[PDB]
Design an enzyme around this catalytic site. Sequence first.
Site, short mmCIF file in Angstrom:
data_model
loop_
_atom_site.label_atom_id
_atom_site.label_comp_id
_atom_site.label_asym_id
_atom_site.label_seq_id
_atom_site.Cartn_x
_atom_site.Cartn_y
_atom_site.Cartn_z
CG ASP A 191 49.19 53.06 16.63
OD1 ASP A 191 50.43 52.41 16.44
OD2 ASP A 191 48.37 52.74 16.59
CG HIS A 197 58.69 51.44 42.96
ND1 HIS A 197 57.92 51.40 40.79
CD2 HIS A 197 57.20 51.13 43.75
CE1 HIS A 197 56.94 50.62 41.36
NE2 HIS A 197 56.42 50.37 42.38
#
Lengths: 115, 1360
Positions: free
Chosen positions: B11, B835
């Site tokens: 990362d 949603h």
Amino acid sequence: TLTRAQKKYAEAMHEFINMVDDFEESTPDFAKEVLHDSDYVVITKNEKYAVALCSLSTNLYLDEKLVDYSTVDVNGVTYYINIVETNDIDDLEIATDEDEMKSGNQEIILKSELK
Amino acid sequence: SMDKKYSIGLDIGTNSVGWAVITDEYKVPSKKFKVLGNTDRHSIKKNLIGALLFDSGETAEATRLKRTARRRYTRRKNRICYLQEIFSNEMAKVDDSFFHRLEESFLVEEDKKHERHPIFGNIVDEVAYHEKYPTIYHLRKKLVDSTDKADLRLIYLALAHMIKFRGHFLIEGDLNPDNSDVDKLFIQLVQTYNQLFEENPINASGVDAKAILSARLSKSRRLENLIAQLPGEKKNGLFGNLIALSLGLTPNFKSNFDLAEDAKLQLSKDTYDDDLDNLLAQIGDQYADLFLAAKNLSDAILLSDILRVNTEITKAPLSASMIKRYDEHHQDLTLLKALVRQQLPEKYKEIFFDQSKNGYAGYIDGGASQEEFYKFIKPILEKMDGTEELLVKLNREDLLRKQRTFDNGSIPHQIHLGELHAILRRQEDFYPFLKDNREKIEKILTFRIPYYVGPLARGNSRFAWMTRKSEETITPWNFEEVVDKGASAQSFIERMTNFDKNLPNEKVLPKHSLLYEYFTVYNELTKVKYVTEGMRKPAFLSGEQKKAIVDLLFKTNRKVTVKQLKEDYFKKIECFDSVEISGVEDRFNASLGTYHDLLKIIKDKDFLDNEENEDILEDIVLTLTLFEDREMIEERLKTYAHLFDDKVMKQLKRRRYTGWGRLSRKLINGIRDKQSGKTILDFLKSDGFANRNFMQLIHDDSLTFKEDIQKAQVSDSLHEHIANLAGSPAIKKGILQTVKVVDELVKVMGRHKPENIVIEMARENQTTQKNSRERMKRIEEGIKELGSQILKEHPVENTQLQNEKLYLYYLQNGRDMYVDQELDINRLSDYDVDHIVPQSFLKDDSIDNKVLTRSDKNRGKSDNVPSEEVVKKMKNYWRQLLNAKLITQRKFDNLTKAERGGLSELDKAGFIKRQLVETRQITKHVAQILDSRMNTKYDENDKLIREVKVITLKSKLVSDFRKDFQFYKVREINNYHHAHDAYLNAVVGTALIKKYPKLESEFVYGDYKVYDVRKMIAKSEQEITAKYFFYSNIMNFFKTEITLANGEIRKRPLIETNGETGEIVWDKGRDFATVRKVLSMPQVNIVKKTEVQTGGFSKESILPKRNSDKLIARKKDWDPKKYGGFDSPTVAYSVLVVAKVEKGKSKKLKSVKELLGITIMERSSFEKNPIDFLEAKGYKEVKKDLIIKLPKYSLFELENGRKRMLASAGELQKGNELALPSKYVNFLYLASHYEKLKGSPEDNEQKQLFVEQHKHYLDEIIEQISEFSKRVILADANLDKVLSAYNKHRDKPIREQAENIIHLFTLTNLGAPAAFKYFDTTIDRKRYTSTKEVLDATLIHQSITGLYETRIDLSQLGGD
RNA sequence: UGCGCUUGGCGUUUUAGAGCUAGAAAUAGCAAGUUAAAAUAAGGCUAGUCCGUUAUCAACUUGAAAAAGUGGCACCGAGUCGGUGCUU
């Protein structure tokens, strides 16, 4: 263009209008040199000078050293844009009444500058 | 185990790179590592995970400003040297040492090698002169006017003060009305305004601007008197705020352009420049010409107000007017002191004697500004009688003004030249050498180095490109004949062109290229839709429609509104009645400015449109962008002189341009599609029914442009490789630090390359309510478009617009989204947020995809988008919202998908692309490098052998994954999460690459077989054989049971496997355990990259003199006890020194072991001869072997595992990390999220139980911290202070008690201690100011990973 | 999204613009202020009307420098990393 320190303050300045009083007298900047050297920008509302809080090294001594501040005025009251210069280690003082001052001050924002 | 297959996680950041190694089983391996050093520890174990931390990488620009700063000052010192040299031979006759006294003006009487009075050298002549010439301007006027021979020192001073401070060069040639007068520059303003605004012109033909503006009245009065002549302009109109800006005020352009955040602009602010750029970006490049016509006016007024003379009294308007200002200052001051003696005599001392105060004493002696000062005496004048005149000057900003001041930016060097020129013409008969150098001197003032020419170097400058014509020193006289202007310019053009990121080696067009403008309009035009009656679905434009529109609207208008398009074209030309338009809103952003600019000046329409003139026309623009310079522009338009009139030709060069685009001409037209032979721009014009866009064309893999771009990014060596990629300088450092970590890791792993490298890039850009105003702004304009009364009836406030339920209430106008029902604003707690495109199909949590309904049951029974019934019932209602912009187009479509048969394979294949492919181009470059570095071998056909698969993940997938399974993250605790994130990518990435290998092309760097996604997709649930999925959300196979949009539950096996390989990808029960195990491991490798400081020697504040010897001299000879200096100098690195030094009056050698800070300035010195340097700084008997370099963040371990990091030669930072158990982590997440959970009600309750049932974890946590601070932080007073403070609020809410428990972490955080508060209560930081302990402590040198270390016990030094 | 070239105005610092009356002084009363010079990273040699604050940097070894080298594994644990069969 723009001082590296200066730019990280101008944005700091945007955030204070973000608090918003639509104040109308436009915010002031200190000379570039003061800003690079100074480590921290704090704004203190309600007509009082900024910061100066102590730091107890391994009793307590003062940690933050002030510079120039401008009494920018919101419709009601003075908001200083106090500028704080972080203290070098060897040089230090010992506080008295001030510990009382740090507790009874309310400051809207402190923004790291050099970093 | 056997397995030497491994994959790497990463990362990448601006301040961190987390990294992890995993095995096929998602475990993090463990190894003992050889510990070099003199201690007894000769190996230790470490888990293969960690993260490298480092200070950000900083831009060059900061240094550049210093460089020019330095260049400016150096070449001013040279001007004066050209003067004195001419003067000097004569001067020597008149004064032996006159120049010398000036040379030493700075110095104190004790150090001067000549007499202390500079001009004349005796106190009598000096004091006389100052009473006779109180300023330099008195001297300048006298010399400009008088007919007497003047003393030669005085002629010098005058001339040297015009030359030293020589004013601006903004205006080219002689001053005249069109470049200097207030009216003309007023006209250009309104001309610039009307060009912008054909629809609503300003006409000011009768209006007398010069007089209105010029007159001596407060800025604000002049603003009213002007808007007073312009009926139909509001005082705070766009035109009114433009004059306000012109007078120096602070207008708010917010209202003028309907901005979310206000745009207060002030011409005197330094930040104005990018304050303007902030506004411009929102409102476009087009308006820049306005604010620049405002700026010039701003100069015009200030200059008008500085020269307050009637000309011909003197050839020195400037000096004469400063004198006036002097006299005026005198008069007004005297009266003032009168008026204070009389009325407020107690305050006389403070005002005129105290330099601490903002009063007059501070103004002169205490460095107060004029601004600070007025604001001091303003209340005081107001209290008194007889101040009427003074208040007028104050509020006009004209009271007690100094002659050198902030305004004088606006004073053109031509004016100075005027007085310079006069003085020479008076004297040149009294001093023949001035007759003979008159033209030399004037040249000293007026000559300027060209922008193109650059530093006048001779092969020793990295920056310079200039070409000599002869090897002699360049002087402002010989310049044109020593420098090859043409050649030097030519090398200018090459250096100051940027290349096309997509296609480097190819220059970028000027931003005002007609071709860039045609391109930009044809790109916006290509996405526009329309409906006439009987319109079928919403249609795109024909290529032939487009080519007529541009022909009629665009080549007839600077800017084209929908109204003209709706009316001017559709009704008029296609003979329509009413045409709905979609895909553009209000007006077009891109217009052919450069076409209209060239039509005006060239007045030959055929010429612009010929399209074989494009080349001639594009070179023109190119020169007017490249060059400011008048001379060069003339040289560079010479060959089109024949084509054009000398009326136009002159007018051509008077058009100038600024700015470059992102793209190359070769991009837009040069390249072609293999199949079609159609360039990019060729597609934008005609693409048929399917009307693609430029971003699409590059992405679109069915065409030759994407692939040639890839094939065109071609770039060798490492840093060059790193240098090349686009992106911030800080992220180049991290990319570089990433690849080094990978190299170390590979080395760590036996030099075996991994199976895969998972990349993701962390985002740490949470700048701020930027969005919370826009939320309110959206609602207002929305609620106004609908004409609803909702905001009146239910009060507006934009900070509680952060409650999504509250936010959606308003966006839906206080109604149910699935029914013709009102909602109750109070009762939202009851309602469900739904949603639209279910989670199962894709993970979209955006407001775009969410709606508020009384119960999610209202949507329909489906697992699809909502039911055909709801759609037909609400579609009208939804249409009103869309027209009012409360809902986006995409949102409308998604609701109404059922109409269209619902979620297709094509839809689903789109959600899949959406989730996998990383959109940021910079991670792809990072991938290329690593793939390139890792993969080195080719096979027996010269195909690259990809041994390592380098995978890039969207950050979201991991972030979603943590949230999904309760692997919660709380940055405020420590730095491990950086490393954890890397691990979790490595896991999610590799799983995915096992379970969906055919999807490789999307997420693996390389060239692979692109597979139509749809083939992968199953037509039905029962279809589930070689079908990858029926439900889009690609992360589904991790979950045991997934819920659908209608409460139904679809289960999945504990043990997923790829069907075709049969490889086993995930055991839901077994594998999660492995993850939880890894995250709660206590030993993670956290390395702070240690760094030698670079840059400035010290703070830049030149301070006043002190006895104290700390301050640093500005010139070698300038003792700061006498001359002041800089205060704090940056330490480059410290250095352990062991030696013996004198200790008392005896001068006896005591052995010391000390720590010395080497300043950046001292580095050179100490690094040439380290002993000699140390010996001169007092140490003796130094031991060379012993000395150790110790930069910032150097690591020591004390007793009991306590560790410290070196901040300076006298100060430490906390060096320890607090690995808290995993259970308390998620506790502190959930706790401090108690209200805004954003989870389904039934578990959103389930988690709140868990918190209520574990409030005893609060106390357990504090004791975690308590034992930690006693052991390492060792700041007892503070921990006592908090230990009471948590007692003081044990009964406050758990959501509040937790959220403050998170601040408390600052105490245990790595790095320098900071101040922090629990509730009201505030803790002062405990600073570690002794570096003594370290000397006997243990050092630890770490490789980048922290895996290879070398341990050095420092308590074995002190001996032989 | 970097990176680069010209040029200004302030600002800061030290000196120069005879401070006076009254008084032993302590001190008080008054006068005066607006300007300039100079430096503006210390400096450096390559001596240019150049260059001097970006990138880059654990340790130990070789090199003149780009640069090259240097550190078994298996399991069972987990309070910052522990132990043990093996390899040598």
